[PDB]
Amino acid sequence: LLRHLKISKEQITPVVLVVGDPGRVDKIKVVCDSYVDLAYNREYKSVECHYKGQKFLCVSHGVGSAGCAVCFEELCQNGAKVIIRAGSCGSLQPDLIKRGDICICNAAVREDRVSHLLIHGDFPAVGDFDVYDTLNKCAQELNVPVFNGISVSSDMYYPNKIIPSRLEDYSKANAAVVEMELATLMVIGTLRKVKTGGILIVDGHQLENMIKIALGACAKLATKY
Questions:
Q1: Which entry of 26, 133, 155, 203 is annotated as an active-site residue?
Q2: The pairing of beta strand 44-51 with beta strand 34-41
Q3: Of 47, 48, 81, 87, which Cα lies nearest the Cα of 64?
Q4: In the chain, N or C: fewer CB atoms in 10 Å?
Q5: Could you give the dihedral angle defined by the CA atoms of residues 2, 82, 183 and 154, in that order, rounded to the nearest 10 degrees?
Q6: Spatial contact of 198 and 87, defined as CB atoms under 8 Å apart
Q7: Partners of 149 in beta bridges
Q8: What controls how active this protein is?
Q9: Nearest Cα to Cα of residue 107 among 21, 61, 174, 155
Q10: Helices assigned H by DSSP within 99-198
Q11: 114 with 160: CB under 8 angstroms?
């Protein structure tokens, strides 16, 4: 049994949908054709999801890079082949990417520590193209407009007035979106030979759509294994 997930290696599917809020696993499992509740340990909720004739895990990783890293490391080290993060984000391009908009990200700014404790800072946090294009191909089938871009993955939610935040610098660098976990998934994916991707709803109905794309992509990708 896995230390934090508390599910077995035998319960891990090639494809896994990951989200931050365990309450969100509960909302996702409902719209699937059927589900099997697996475990709920600390912030980590596991449910097996049956959708469009496919079987995939939906696991919650909690808030922040270090606690999600424990979830991803346990997934990646025990059989996951594809991990897609369905999550929530903020806009770094207001007057373009507005509240409600969905964004499918190829890359992420590494504003964590853990990824850096795994590999030198120069290394890219980058998603898998197969996964990215699949996510993109699902949105199109569903006629749901999505943005594409770089995500700033920052360990800081609440800034101080001492150290100037780099969010404006990253915005100017055309980073689209800001969240907390993507770069970690992405580096861990690359290191562990797991294909990753990320789909985010802009926060600070469209959720229905977002989840459909996420569930759509997971099913499409699950077919391969």
A1: 203
A2: antiparallel
A3: 87
A4: N
A5: -60
A6: yes
A7: 105
A8: Inhibited by Immucillin-H and 5'-methylthio-Immucillin-H. Inhibited by 5'-deaza-1'-aza-2c-deoxy-1'-(9-methylene)-Immucilin-G (DADMe-ImmG).
A9: 174
A10: 129-141, 167-172, 182-192
A11: no
Q: Which two tokens stand for residue 212?
A: 């459909």
Q: Which residue has the tokens 């896994």?
A: 16
CA angle 102-103-106, nearest 5°?
A: 160
The tally of domains found in the chain comes to 1
Alpha carbon distance 184, 66 (integer Å): 8
> Which domain, by its residues, includes 145?
1-225
To the query of whether residue 33 is one of the catalytic residues in this protein, the response is no
Instruction: Determine the Cα angle at 32 with ends 26 and 34, to 5°.
Output: 90
Tokens matching residue 213: 């794309």
- Binding-site residues for phosphate, please? 20-24, 42, 85-88
Q: Residue holding tokens 């997930």?
A: 5
Measured over the CA atoms of residue 37, residue 26, residue 45 and residue 68, the dihedral's sign is: positive
HSE, side-chain direction, 13 A CA sphere, residue 164: 4
* Residue 99: CB atoms within 10 Å: 12
Tell me the structure's resolution in angstroms, rounded to a single decimal: 2.4
Q: How many CA atoms lie within 13 A of 180 on its CB side?
A: 18
What CATH number is attached to the domain comprising 179? 3.40.50.1580
Q: Which residues are annotated as a binding site?
A: 4, 20-24, 42, 85-88, 180-181
Q: What is the C-alpha separation between 209 and 14, in angstroms, rounded?
A: 24
Method: X-ray
Contacts of 170 (CB under 8 A, 6+ apart): 92, 109, 152, 178
